[PDB]
A paper describes a structure:
The 26S proteasome is the major non-lysosomal protease engaged in degradation of intracellular proteins. The heart of each 26S proteasome is the 20S core particle (CP), consisting of seven different α- and seven different β-subunits, arranged in a cylindrical complex of four stacked rings following an α1–7β1–7β1–7α1–7 stoichiometry. The proteolytically active sites reside in the β1-, β2-, and β5-subunits and are buried on the inner side of the protease. The β-subunits subsequently use the heteroheptameric α-ring as a docking platform to assemble in a well-defined order resulting in an α1–7β1–7 precursor complex (half-CP).
The pup1G170A-ProA-H7 mutant yCP was purified by affinity chromatography and crystallised after tag removal by Tobacco Etch Virus (TEV) protease. The structural data visualised the incorporation of the point mutation [name] and verified correct autolysis of the yβ2-propeptide. The X-ray crystallographic data visualise that the point mutation [name] leads to significant rearrangements in a loop region of the C-terminal appendage of subunit yβ2. Detailed inspection of the site of mutation reveals that Ala170 would be too close to Arg19 from the same subunit (3.0 Å) as well as to the C-terminal amino acid Asp190 from subunit yβ6′ of the opposite β-ring (2.6 Å). To avoid steric clashes, the guanidine group of Arg19 (yβ2) and the carboxylate of Asp190 (yβ6′) are shifted by up to 1.6 Å. Hereby, the hydrogen bonds between Arg19NH2 and Asp190OD2 (WT: 3.1 Å; mt: 5.1 Å) as well as Arg19NH2 and the C-terminus of subunit yβ6 (WT: 3.1 Å; mt: 4.5 Å) are broken. Furthermore, slight backbone distortions around the mutation shorten the distance between Ser171O and Pro192CD from 3.5 Å to 2.9 Å. This close contact leads to a flip of Pro192 out of the hydrophobic pocket provided by Ile163, Trp164, Val173 and Leu190 of yβ2, however, without changing its trans conformation. The reorientation of Pro192 triggers twisting of the succeeding yβ2-amino acids Asn193-Glu196 outwards on the protein surface (shift of Pro192Cα: 1.6 Å; Asn193Cα: 6.6 Å; Val194Cα: 5.7 Å; Arg195Cα: 4.8 Å; Glu196Cα: 2.0 Å; Glu197Cα: 0.6 Å), hereby loosening intra- and inter-subunit contacts. Most likely, mutation of Gly170 enhances the structural flexibility of the C-terminal tail of yβ2 and impairs the association with subunit yβ3 of the same β-ring/CP half (cis interactions).
Numbering used by the authors:
A (entry chain a): 1 to 232
B (entry chain Q): 1 to 125
C (entry chain H), D (entry chain Z): 1 to 222
E (entry chain I): 1 to 204
F (entry chain Y): 1 to 212
G (entry chain J), I (entry chain X): 1 to 195
H (entry chain N), J (entry chain b): 1 to 196
Write the structure that this text describes.
């Protein structure tokens, strides 16, 4: 048993017709102190998987090393490590999910909420969640922390059920994700303007975008707001 | 720990350490058991090569395992004490858990089991 | 519960869902959560249900008496000031959280009020367990100088976000529109789901199924 | 302090017919007032004509199903591909559960299938392994809402034959698979209306001598 | 310890076509111990019926209080109180004990003598009105009652059909509650006749 | 819960209720609170359901191994002590068990041992365990005799559970009856308390306080 | 205090109350009368917290005696029981509640009927054919449920009461030092001096 | 919350962020924490919003009644009324208030009233959760008798950093300028102050 | 368990132990023998936590019986008591201590003297002319301090014991259902079947 | 405690105060919080003195054994060893450590290891109770590729303010300069830095 110290907020994601998108801001908070501003919380595994992690950053860095070690280990005595016997999103998730549930069962959890996003060998989209309790679930849209409360409602307006996925393009999906990140910046006190976004497409592969910023913000209406009731 | 297999099979299918243990029994003083209609008698030989012995305190050849069962033996005297102690402990353990004293057959089966165990355990004769 | 308030060019609109729960159990599928303080000052609340209703009626009562005394139509700042001072006095033991909206001779207003007695001003506000689902929709689409039509749409879309995504929010959408210089128009069940459930069975029993020991006429007349 | 447990909501229902058995459950997964998934399967085909659901804390539920499926695999390996009977599976699950008696699987487990005489069978477990063969058993969030209805409509409790006035009970006539599926759908439709954790979808697994079949029905999403 | 579940018991009310029904179990207990099988929880003031579940001392106290208040109401108003008006009186009376409440779950049932409209209403222990068209439930088996009522209920039932529906709702709900049962009473209420029926049920 | 067991001329009568509750919620009315350890030995369920089920099933496995090894029926004394010694090892860990181990052997005759999760092992003639034990004891104590017939003894045990099922909120559902003889136990059926109550009331004239 | 029982038969009400007074470690008295006569045909037995029991009982006694003098009339048992219930219901939300449980046994001279009321410290009133407080009912109700008849004589009620006390003396852990038994009928209140 | 008040040559300027949080949720991102208790006597509020609003409303009432009887009150008098409420009700309040005002006789004055109800007259004052991160910056960069533009820059830069590090602070930067010329409201948006 | 008394007279040791076994609300048994014979001339009575009492007693009994067989000799009461004290002293710092208090009454055949040892669950041993555990001594020691003589007969010891039990039955709140009395002398151990 | 490490053109400089408190009592006013784990790899310690001394001693041991086998370790390697101890024993440690070192290949590097056991490579780092007060100042005044004299001034000014506001910080300002030229120790007394 512990308590999280340096933490990362929401990770948000969704499926679209040819793949998945995932995003997370670049902040590492120390309680109410916005201590670290250059933290990458999206960690790619090969060219077909991206693992987005929220929660305790020290545990994230540990998981990051486990994934790095997983790639090394898979390459051992494996002539098809860059082909048929390459790591799949489903392999990477199941491994993490096993670790997370084992850790909670020893009453020593990895204080995280994780979303594994990727594309399988057969082109199928993969998107599944796991947290410190070892709880797992899948959905067309997935989000952690504040994103679960604010991002999911917005993303579910685009893909409300399974049948909406083929109808959703990457431009529409990315647009919805980018808007959700803006909304979270407005309303989450532990968020930052800077974020990373990753797209895993079955045709164009893995596109990793760093140093993105929340833009087109509405603040002008603040000038007219005066007092808290009677003040003019 | 010392794990050496002392009791092993020979080409002719004999375990010599067990057979040589019988030769130790052959050397031991004679013991005899006879059961009547309403009694059992245990007779034991005392070799008279040892006089000046104190018969009050010298270990007697027949030992009570419980108030209703006795054990006599032929062979190594020191070895017999280990079996007698184990049998006595088991007799009390039986009374404690089953709430009934051991049958003569049960006590025999236990002692015999200990003897067998020492014929296929490592590091023991 | 999901409640929103949205300001527009010449008025204000307040909206709410209609689910009323006892914990995880639903008691009323069509609760009217939109209330009156005065004819053109409406409110809706979350928290302790009896406290939101009781505090609305009490201030509404005094607002009426005040309006009569002063020969003036009641102001939203008056409902606001009377509410917060009452709630503050009780240090949040009256679990009343409200969104208060209305028009008066001064203009159109939108306030949120919290159990401990703090108030807020805004052009769009949300409240209840569905507050975050609603605010996500409001932060995505609210703009300055909305028309009455746009503001009703934004408000009811914000409630829908709560209905679908919040377990404590469900069923229908109630709306009340307070435009300046007009009568406030209250739109009960402004949105309903189309379609109606039909069960596989009818459970209507055969008569005489229940066993009975006694019968008697109850004298209800004097 | 770290809480190793959680509640993912959900409601499941197992009914044993004369020559069949069903095990149903909603497809909604939740924490607190949020929806995690509208479709997250909860009832599983575990092989050898056995269906299983472990409702409550989904991490423990997934672990237990995973371990039992594994136990079926090793039962075949160890006993010449012998078919694991429903009664043997039940006793096996008791041991899986009781092995964690002092750090339990926070779940209410139900399995369904056919016994060795071809008759329908449902077994119900508590979190630490106590079990019983039953005819009808609801588990999870809305179990208290469903079971009284089932006592009334499956076992005809409190129902007497008209004209006799409580002297003759309603006879217990056998129900068909189609009749049972109606009671299941109506049970979940009612539960969805009055319980906030129940909704989204209903997946039923039917077990006969011909094998395992699935049926899916939508539920309200609010 | 929990005051609302020391004595046990349940009340349910339903609306039908030109009629209302209200029903209750007869148990009073001290936790596990059954004390009385004749503790009726439904009372009436004129043509307005009030069922009360919860802590039995408060049930008795509130009955006496509402008899008190409806009697004075009648003397002054020169007419019997109506269900809608009484509902507000119950709400008012409960909320005046906001920070020292009666541990009860009241249920009002009746027909307006002037409009002929059937009426039911429920309250939490501090007066929040639940104003539902179909049915109102209360007591230690309220979950069970919600389940029964949601599935068994259909609108516009005739008086004698409504009797069967509400009776089966109560009975089967009570049989899944340890602290409810030991007998049951059902009131069928029409504009100018009320029938009271005692049900036969298991006594465990 | 209400369970009882008593010794008499014809052996042992075992009678239990069938109700299981989780708070006020009645989880089941069809619970088997008599565990058939083997064809000669019975155990009652009270306290923890899993604890009683699991360890009394395990007890049957130990009794079976005993008679394989010793070629003789296990005594009720020895069987009961296997269970009491086991739970005593777990003492403090949180097992919950209140059971009567009932049997009829040659050397002992009809024998009952109350075994309990804090290590208690008591031999006796009459035992009653559960939330409704006090109600059952009253009927038992005032009507018990050694020279009861098997028929009258069965009824007494049935009537004593009924008494408890009526007054105790957490007891009821149905009554399960068993008669333990030297040649093994004999099941004497499941009796719905609902139907039993009215039947007994009429035939016996008891429960005048209740209207029927 | 500990055991207080009551049984209403054909023509009378019988109250049985334990004699022991225990203060922690020692039994200070074995002849305590846990009852007060409220009026010639109304008797109240009591049990609960030390001090509060007698204070409450004597307070009720005084109020009923005052009423009897003012009106030159004996209140009905039902009226007395309703008065007592209100006092206890009032008490439960007080600064320091009376922790007292009572049984009221009276003979209504107007209706010519015995009546037994059971009221707990919360103000929970019930009219019964037989009643008790504390754990007393747990041991005795199964016997009363079996043997009770509404047409029992006073002698039959006493015999059934003996059976109840015998079961209490067998299965109760505490020594309550026997019971004092009193009968309430049309002729008033009298104590059975041999029990 | 990040609030400050700074005296300068021509008077005094109050500054504040606009973020109001309930835990990690931003309940209001456009809050006005600069409140008027008299024409040229304003305050910056920190702590319980309910408490600081209630206090400010009572003070505004007291100064309105004061003005009706004795004419325009001094900034010191306003601070005293604040202090009296905060000190006497210290057990039931969580309020940290900075009082700033302009007289013609006394010019710009700043009073800070921390949790206990003590009063401290200062050249400038900082308060709120975000103030902790700018004690060093403000101490190094403050000068007496700055110009209006320098003081606006000083406050803008100071609260910019407070917002940068404190998650409880954010939104826009509001300011109120108090001089002989009158009362001027200023607002600065994120895209302006974040790039400083 | 509850009351265990012991008294050493001229030529014997008398142990009196209560018969009741109470599990919370009900008295489950009224004929329980809270004693074990460790050897022909040594008896141990016990009281304490449920389960631990009998488990400890039977464990001691087995160990002494084992010693008796191995050496064909009966240990002296003093030796048996020292063994028991060590086991309890060992137990008190264990993971889960035996919560058992004992009295050891024995006749030393070598010295021709009766001996009574009192040992509590901590391993606190004392040799006494008379002893008890729990609250039993609070009621009885004043009577024993007065009447006891080291030259008392067995019959006089039994009469003094009756007086002690009578005082316990009067002033103790709990019903301990009488006592089983056993005498330990040169001829061994016997039970007084009428007390 | 007030500690910091700053990279500059020629390498890196560590800085620290010298105050060690037991409650409000200053148990040591001349503490050396700049500790050497290798020739040109030093660290700044914050948190439990017992824990940070124990950790530093173990690290010094590990790097000594590393050097005997594999030659001079990198600053990154030193940080990893620190992290490994801090992360794996996070339940039983209260340590906040800044690691600074000079390679010829990598030049000046700074790693901060906060409470949880995470590692963060930064241009400069601040830590300790007094760091809170200089987040604003340090962010505004830090530049990359400063000169030795500029970096000394930056640290001197920064810790001067941290000491000014934090009661847990004080005494002298110690500094250690790590360059290709070698290792230089600096000390600055109160009469120097208080007047800045
Ligand atoms: Mg729902
Ligand atoms: Mg919803
Ligand atoms: Mg019931
Ligand atoms: Mg019952
Ligand atoms: Mg910020």
């Amino acid at each position: 048993t512990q308590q999280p110290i340096v933490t990362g907020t929401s990770v948000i994601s969704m499926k679209y017709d040819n793949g998945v998108i995932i995003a997370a801001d670049n902040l590492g908070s120390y309680g109410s102190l916005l201590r670290f501003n250059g933290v990458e919380r999206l960690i790619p595994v090969g060219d077909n998987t991206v693992v987005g992690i929220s929660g305790d950053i020290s545990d994230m860095q540990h998981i990051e090393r486990l994934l790095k070690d997983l790639v090394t280990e898979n390459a051992y005595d494996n002539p098809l490590a860059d082909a048929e016997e390459a790591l799949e999103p489903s392999y990477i998730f199941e491994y993490l999910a096993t670790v997370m549930y084992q850790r909670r069962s020893k009453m020593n959890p990895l204080w995280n909420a994780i979303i594994v996003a990727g594309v399988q060998s057969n082109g199928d989209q993969f998107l599944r969640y796991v947290n410190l309790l070892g709880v797992t679930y899948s959905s067309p849209t997935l989000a952690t922390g504040f994103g679960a409360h604010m991002a999911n409602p917005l993303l579910r307006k685009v893909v409300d059920r399974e049948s909406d996925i083929p109808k959703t393009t990457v431009q529409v999906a990315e647009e919805a994700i980018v808007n959700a990140m803006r909304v979270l910046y407005y309303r989450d006190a532990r968020s930052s303007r800077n974020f990373s976004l990753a797209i895993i497409d079955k045709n164009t592969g893995l596109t990793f975008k760093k140093n993105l910023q929340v833009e087109n913000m509405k603040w002008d209406f603040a000038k007219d707001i005066k007092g808290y009731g009677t003040q003019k | 720990g010392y794990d050496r297999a002392l009791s092993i099979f020979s080409p002719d299918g004999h375990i010599f350490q067990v057979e040589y243990a019988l030769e130790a029994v052959k050397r031991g003083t004679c013991a005899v058991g006879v059961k009547g209609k309403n009694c059992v008698v245990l007779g034991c030989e005392r070799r008279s090569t040892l006089k000046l012995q104190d018969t009050r305190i010298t270990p007697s050849k027949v030992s009570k395992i419980d108030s209703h069962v006795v054990l006599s033996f032929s062979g190594l005297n020191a070895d017999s004490r280990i079996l007698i102690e184990k049998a006595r402990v088991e007799a009390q353990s039986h009374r404690l858990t089953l709430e009934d004293p051991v049958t003569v057959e049960y006590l025999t089966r236990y002692v015999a089991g200990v003897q067998q165990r020492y014929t296929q355990s490592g590091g023991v004769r | 519960t999901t409640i929103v308030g949205v300001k527009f060019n010449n008025g204000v609109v307040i909206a709410a869902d209609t689910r009323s729960t006892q914990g995880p159990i639903v008691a009323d599928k069509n609760c009217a959560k939109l209330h009156r303080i005065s004819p053109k000052i409406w409110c809706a609340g979350a928290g302790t249900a009896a406290d939101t209703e009781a505090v609305t009626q009490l201030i509404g009562s005094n607002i009426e008496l005040h309006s009569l005394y002063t020969s003036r139509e009641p102001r939203v700042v008056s409902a606001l000031q009377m509410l917060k001072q009452h709630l503050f006095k009780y240090q949040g033991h009256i679990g009343a959280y409200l969104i208060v909206a209305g028009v008066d001779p001064t203009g159109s207003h939108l306030f949120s009020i919290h159990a401990h007695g703090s108030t807020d001003v805004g052009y769009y506000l949300s409240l209840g367990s569905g507050s975050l689902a609603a605010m996500a929709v409001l932060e995505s689409h609210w703009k300055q100088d909305l028309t009455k039509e746009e503001a009703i749409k934004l408000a009811s879309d914000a409630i829908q976000a709560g209905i679908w995504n919040d377990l404590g929010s469900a069923s229908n959408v109630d709306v009340c529109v307070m435009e300046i210089g007009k009568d406030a128009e209250y739109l009960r069940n402004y949105l309903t789901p189309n379609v109606r459930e039909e069960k596989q069975k009818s459970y209507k029993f055969p008569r005489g199924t229940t066993a009975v020991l006694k019968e008697s006429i109850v004298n209800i007349c004097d | 302090q770290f809480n190793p447990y959680g509640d993912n909501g959900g409601t499941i229902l197992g009914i044993a017919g004369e020559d069949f058995a069903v095990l149903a459950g909603d497809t909604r997964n939740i924490t607190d007032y949020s929806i995690n998934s509208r479709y997250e399967p909860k009832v599983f085909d575990c092989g050898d004509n056995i269906v299983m659901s472990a409702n409550g804390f989904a991490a423990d539920g997934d672990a237990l199903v995973k371990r039992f499926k594994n136990s079926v695999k090793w039962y075949h390996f160890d006993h010449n591909d012998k078919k694991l009977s429903i009664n043997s599976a039940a006793r096996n699950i008791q041991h899986l559960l009781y092995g964690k008696r002092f750090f339990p699987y926070y779940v209410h487990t139900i399995i369904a299938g056919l016994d060795e005489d071809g008759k329908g069978a449902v077994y119900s477990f508590d979190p630490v392994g106590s079990y019983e063969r039953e005819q009808c058993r609801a588990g999870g969030a809305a179990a208290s809402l469903i079971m009284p209805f089932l006592d009334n409509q499956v076992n005809f409790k409190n129902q007497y034959e008209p004209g006799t006035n409580g002297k003759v009970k309603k006879p217990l006539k056998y129900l068909s698979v189609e009749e049972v599926i109606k009671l299941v759908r109506d049970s979940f439709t009612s539960a969805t209306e009055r319980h906030i954790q129940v909704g989204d979808g209903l997946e039923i697994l039917i077990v006969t001598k011909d094998g395992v079949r699935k049926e899916f029905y939508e539920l309200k999403r609010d | 310890s929990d005051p609302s579940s020391i004595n046990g018991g349940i009340v349910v009310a339903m609306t039908g076509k030109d009629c209302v029904a209200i029903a209750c179990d007869l148990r009073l207990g001290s936790q596990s111990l059954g004390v009385s099988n004749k503790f009726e929880k439904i009372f009436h003031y004129g043509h307005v019926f009030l069922g009360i579940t919860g802590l039995a001392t408060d049930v008795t106290t509130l009955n006496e209080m509402f008899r008190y208040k409806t009697n004075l109401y009648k003397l002054k108003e020169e007419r019997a109180i109506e269900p809608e008006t009484f509902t507000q009186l119950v709400s008012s009376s409960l909320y005046e004990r906001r920070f020292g409440p009666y541990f009860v779950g009241p249920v009002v049932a009746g027909i307006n003598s002037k409009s002929g409209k059937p009426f039911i209403a429920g309250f939490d222990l501090i007066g929040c009105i639940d104003e539902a068209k179909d049915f109102i439930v209360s007591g230690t088996a309220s979950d069970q009652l919600f389940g029964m009522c949601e599935s068994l209920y259909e609108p516009n039932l005739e008086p004698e059909d409504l009797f069967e529906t509400i009776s089966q709702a109560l009975l089967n709900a009570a049989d899944r509650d340890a602290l409810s049962g030991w007998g049951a009473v059902v009131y069928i209420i029409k504009k100018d006749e009320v029938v009271k029926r005692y049900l036969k049920m298991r006594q465990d | 819960t209400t369970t009882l067991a008593f010794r008499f001329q014809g052996g042992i009568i075992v009678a239990v209720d069938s109700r299981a509750t989780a708070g006020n919620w009645v989880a089941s009315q069809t619970v088997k609170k008599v565990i058939e350890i083997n064809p000669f030995l019975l155990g009652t369920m009270a306290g923890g359901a899993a604890d009683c089920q699991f360890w009394e099933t395990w007890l049957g496995s130990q009794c079976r191994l005993h008679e394989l090894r010793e070629k003789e029926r296990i005594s009720v004394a020895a069987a009961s002590k296997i269970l009491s010694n086991l739970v005593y090892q777990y003492k403090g860990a949180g097992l919950s068990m209140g059971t009567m181990i009932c049997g009829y052997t040659r050397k002992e005759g009809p024998t009952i041992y109350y075994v309990d999760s804090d290590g208690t092992r008591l031999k006796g003639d009459i035992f009653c365990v559960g939330s409704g034990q006090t109600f059952a004891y009253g009927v038992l104590d005032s009507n018990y005799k050694w020279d009861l017939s098997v028929e009258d003894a069965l009824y007494l045990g049935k009537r004593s559970i009924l008494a408890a099922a009526h007054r105790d909120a957490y007891s009821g559902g149905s009554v399960n009856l068993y008669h333990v003889t030297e040649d093994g136990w004999i099941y004497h059926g499941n009796h719905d308390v609902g139907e039993l109550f009215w039947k007994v009331k009429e035939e016996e004239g008891s429960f005048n306080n209740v209207i029927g | 205090m500990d055991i207080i029982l009551g049984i209403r038969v054909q023509d009378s009400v019988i109250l049985a109350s334990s004699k022991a007074v225990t203060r922690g470690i020692s039994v200070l008295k074995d002849s305590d009368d846990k009852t007060r006569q409220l009026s010639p045909h109304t008797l109240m037995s009591f049990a609960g917290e030390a001090g509060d029991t007698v204070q409450f009982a004597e307070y009720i006694q005084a109020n009923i005696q005052l009423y009897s003098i003012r009106e030159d009339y004996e209140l009905s048992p039902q009226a007395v029981s309703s008065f007592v219930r209100q006092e206890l219901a009032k008490s439960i939300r007080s600064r320091r509640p009376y922790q007292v449980n009572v049984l009221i046994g009276g003979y209504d001279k107007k209706k010519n009927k015995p009546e037994l009321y059971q009221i707990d410290y919360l103000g929970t009133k019930v009219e019964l054919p037989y009643g008790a407080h504390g754990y007393s009912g747990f041991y005795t109700f199964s016997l009363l449920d079996h043997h009770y008849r509404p047409d029992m004589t006073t002698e039959e009620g006493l015999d059934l009461l003996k059976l109840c006390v015998q079961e209490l003396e067998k299965r109760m852990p505490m020594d309550f030092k026997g019971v004092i038994v009193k009968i309430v009928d049309k002729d008033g209140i009298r104590q059975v001096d041999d029990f | 919350t990040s609030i400050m008040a700074v005296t300068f040559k021509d008077g005094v300027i109050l500054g504040a962020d606009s973020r109001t949080t309930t835990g990690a949720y931003i309940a209001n991102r456009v809050t006005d924490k600069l409140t008027r208790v008299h024409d040229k006597i304003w305050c910056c509020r920190s702590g319980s919003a309910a408490d600081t609003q209630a206090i400010a409303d009572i003070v505004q009432y007291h100064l309105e009644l004061y003005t009706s009887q004795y004419g325009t009150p001094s900034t010191e008098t306003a601070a005293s009324v604040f202090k009296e409420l905060c000190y006497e009700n210290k057990d039931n309040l969580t309020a940290g208030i900075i009082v700033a005002g302009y007289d013609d006789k006394n010019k710009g004055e700043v009073y800070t009233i921390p949790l206990g109800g003590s009063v401290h007259k200062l050249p400038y004052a900082i308060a709120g959760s975000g103030s902790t991160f700018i004690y060093g910056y403000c101490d190094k960069n403050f000068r007496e008798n700055m110009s209006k533009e320098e003081t606006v820059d000083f406050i803008k830069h100071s609260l910019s950093q407070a917002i940068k590090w404190d998650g409880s602070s954010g939104g826009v930067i509001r300011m109120v300028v108090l001089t002989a010329a009158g009362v001027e409201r200023l607002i600065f948006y994120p895209d302006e102050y974040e790039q400083l």
